[PDB]
Swiss-Prot record:
This is UPF0502 protein PSPTO_2686. It comes from the Bacteria. Belongs to the UPF0502 family. It comes from Pseudomonas syringae pv. tomato (strain ATCC BAA-871 / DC3000). The lineage of its organism: Bacteria, Pseudomonadati, Pseudomonadota, Gammaproteobacteria, Pseudomonadales.
Amino acid sequence: NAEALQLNSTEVRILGCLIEKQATNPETYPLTLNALVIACNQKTSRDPVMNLTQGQVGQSLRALEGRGLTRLVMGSRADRWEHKVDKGLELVPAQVILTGLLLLRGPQTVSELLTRSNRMHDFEDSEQVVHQLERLIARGLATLVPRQSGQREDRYMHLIGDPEDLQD
């Protein structure tokens, strides 16, 4: 019934940032366009580092809005934007955080996800993270990435972007 989103690298970055900043500084959220491009081009908490301009962010924001995944919040001071990933993909906040982490940075291990979600959602332990990821997988929104020699820890990745990024 429900097909794949195949969001581009910009749309992926945007949603990540909306989720991140909603959790990490609510006082700044919904994000203005400029706050959003700053969040997109950040050196830290980003893989990879981007350099998207205002117009790229603006059109991906309108493109997303059309898909029901962003919502324009108009106001007297300036337009601010919010994500609609929870309502849109029917996800509990824990799943929205994890998805956010995976969008921002790609394939991550459970312990990385636990550490990075620390000031965003409070997973009491790595069992709760797995609980939630298993559901994302059952949903068709994340995936366990097969490991091989180099690392002896599972990695997880989201299924919301270009599926050819996951293809060798």
